[PDB]
């Protein structure tokens, strides 16, 4: 529980669900 990468479209559209 550490999705800071979720609130970035260039991490949530690599990966597949990291959020």
């Known amino acids: 529980i550490r ?3 979720c609130s ?3 991490c ?3 990966n597949p ?3």
Do not use: L
């Open 17 to 19: 669900h990291v959020c």
């Open 12 to 14: 949530r559209v690599n």
């Open 8 to 10: 970035n479209p260039v």
């Open 3 to 5: 999705d800071e990468c």
